[PDB]
Swiss-Prot record:
This is Albumin. Belongs to the ALB/AFP/VDB family. The gene is ALB. The modification N6-methyllysine is found at K530. GO terms for molecular function: antioxidant activity; copper ion binding; DNA binding; enterobactin binding; exogenous protein binding; fatty acid binding; identical protein binding; protein-folding chaperone binding. Glycated in diabetic patients. Phosphorylated by FAM20C in the extracellular medium. It comes from Homo sapiens.
Length: 578
């Protein structure tokens, strides 16, 4: 029995949480209640298997069990139409079906939060149910959220209320901590969505390389044979978490933190503090630990990678191991490089050895390889230096607008919402990274952009409308950012034709938070650029200034919300004029 296996390892609490998440991530639409029922029915069953390891079907594979359980409600196509099909499938892939149907942008209602007075009550009254609801609301909106980590956020979420509800001003003590979590969780999910994408779209060889480079930077003192160990395991964890095998993901994940702490001295010296706390906190700590200092006297790469005359031979013997080693070596001594840049170099090298080793005199051929790294390394550096200057002058809002205009001209087919979400995120890179010394900027900035661009890539893949986005996304993982930077403006895009409804501002917007207004302002700027691609950043500006005037105005006018209706068609007349 497997269900028993995992139960003993995780225990009741976690076993129950992980299975809730899994269910929530599979049927994002179904109501809180139903999941709980199934989770319980499933948990009880487990409790019998522990005793009699051959009872009913305790001999099966988690999936069969998990799958049939969901299929007791999925067959209701009136609720989940395209799902009933999944249930009519077999064992080899009734699962794939489900995986293939997760929605990255669920049509789930915004999640507003009641006054602090209610939350505390509800929290205090019933706790487990309070935290279950949390997990359910997150896991269903983030179908790829790194499960094991979600538990960490939960324990954290719990302590927020547990302490704030006993304050002198709950609202003051909670709100903040809750805000700080909302963000961190959105960050964490993105980082993970990229991981799953790599594995799923590009294969594990690609995920491995990413890991080798990243880990080699974090643990410069670690040895190639050690890192590989770590990378091999790590991959498996994530391979599981992303395929939806949450339990084993959580198990293996723990075993890895166990290992890493045991062999502390062999890996990093900043692991101490991490290995002195609760599992959940230990794991989350290791994953976010600062790179170790760089080993003192280190040979030059050129030594064994360009000058040696046995290069091509070694390449032939174990090309995978060889390149792995090159990456590990170049990474460990370059924490100032973004993981994708390292990966870009690594690919440039491989490509070179390929053409070069089949030459009349390899050495002569691959002797100037580092000469090609120069361009690759400066490209991001300049990009960053540039974009941080602009950011520093315009401020975050203005900077986002800039990127809003810029991207919409790039890929005009893309849906306004996505363009808005993505450009907003892209601009957050300014505040996030620009305040860093060049030494930490590039890793900060360019890796952050691979995460953001991956949203656009996944969001897009749902309803593909621009081959340009498709090309850039599917072509090469490591090169996406460069690929998009390359794009200027779509010369084939046929401008849109105004729609009364699209540019009619009402008073309803006068109740929304400040943020939700800039957003309404931005969603406007996008629709403009789509109607006037060849327009300039000059015209656009003056206009944005105008729309600001409209809101500040009507939102302070006493007429029925009619201004917005009559003046709404009035501004439309002015706009078309420009
Ligand atoms: C978001 C992260 O940086 C997690 C990190 C990682 C690093 C490279 C590729 C994938 C993930 C990470 C883990 O996911 C992990 C899981 C179990 C035990 C130890 C771990 O350590 C870690 O650094």
């Amino acid at each position: 029995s497997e269900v028993a296996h995992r139960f003993k390892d995780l225990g009741e609490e976690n076993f129950k949480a992980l299975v809730l998440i899994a269910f929530a991530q599979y049927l994002q639409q179904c109501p809180f209640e139903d999941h709980v029922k199934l989770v319980n029915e499933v948990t009880e069953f487990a409790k019998t298997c522990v005793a009699d390891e051959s009872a009913e079907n305790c001999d099966k594979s988690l999936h069969t069990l998990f799958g049939d359980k969901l299929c007791t409600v999925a067959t209701l196509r009136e609720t989940y139409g395209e799902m009933a099909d999944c249930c009519a499938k077999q064992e080899p892939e009734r699962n794939e079906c489900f995986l293939q149907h997760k929605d990255d942008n669920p049509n789930l209602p915004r999640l507003v939060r009641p006054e602090v007075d209610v939350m505390c009550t509800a929290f205090h009254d019933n706790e487990e149910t309070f935290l279950k609801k949390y997990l359910y609301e997150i896991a269903r909106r983030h179908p790829y959220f790194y499960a094991p980590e979600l538990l960490f956020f939960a324990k954290r979420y719990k302590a927020a209320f547990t302490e704030c509800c006993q304050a002198a001003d709950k609202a003051a003590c909670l709100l903040p901590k809750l805000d700080e979590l909302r963000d961190e969780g959105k960050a964490s999910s993105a980082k993970q969505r990229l991981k799953c994408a790599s594995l799923q779209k590009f294969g594990e060889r690609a995920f491995k390389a990413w890991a080798v480079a990243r880990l080699s930077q974090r643990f410069p003192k670690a040895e190639f044979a050690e890192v590989s160990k770590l990378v091999t395991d790590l991959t498996k964890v994530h391979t599981e978490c992303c395929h939806g095998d949450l339990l084993e993901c959580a198990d293996d994940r723990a075993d890895l933190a166990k290992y890493i702490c045991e062999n502390q001295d062999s890996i990093s010296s900043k692991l101490k503090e991490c290995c002195e706390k609760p599992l959940l906190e230990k794991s989350h700590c290791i994953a976010e630990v600062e790179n170790d200092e760089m080993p003192a006297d280190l040979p030059s790469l050129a030594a064994d990678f360009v000058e040696s005359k046995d290069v091509c031979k070694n390449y032939a013997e174990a090309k995978d191991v060889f390149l792995g080693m090159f990456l590990y070596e170049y990474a460990r001594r370059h924490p100032d490089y973004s993981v994708v840049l390292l990966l870009r170099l690594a690919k440039t090298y491989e490509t070179t050895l390929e053409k070069c080793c089949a030459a009349a005199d390899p050495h002569e051929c691959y002797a100037k390889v580092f000469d090609e790294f120069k361009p690759l390394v400066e490209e991001p550096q300049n990009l960053i230096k540039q974009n941080c200057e602009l950011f520093e002058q315009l401020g975050e809002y203005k900077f986002q607008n800039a990127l809003l205009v810029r991207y919409t001209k790039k890929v005009p087919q893309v849906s306004t919402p996505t363009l808005v979400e993505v450009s907003r995120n892209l601009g957050k890179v300014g505040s996030k990274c620009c305040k860093h010394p060049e030494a930490k900027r590039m890793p900060c900035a360019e890796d952050y952009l691979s995460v953001v661009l991956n949203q656009l890539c996944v969001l897009h893949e749902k309803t593909p409308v621009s081959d340009r986005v498709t090309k850039c996304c599917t072509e090469s993982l490591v090169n996406r950012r460069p690929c998009f930077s390359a794009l200027e403006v779509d010369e084939t895009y046929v401008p849109k034709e105004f729609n009364a409804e699209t540019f009619t501002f009402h008073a309803d917007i006068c109740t929304l938070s400040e943020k939700e207004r800039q957003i309404k302002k931005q969603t406007a700027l996008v629709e403009l650029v789509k109607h006037k691609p060849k327009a300039t950043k000059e015209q656009l500006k003056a206009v944005m200034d105008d729309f600001a005037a409209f809101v500040e105005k009507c939102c302070k006018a006493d007429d029925k919300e009619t201004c917005f209706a009559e003046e709404g068609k009035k501004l439309v007349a002015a706009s078309q004029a420009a």
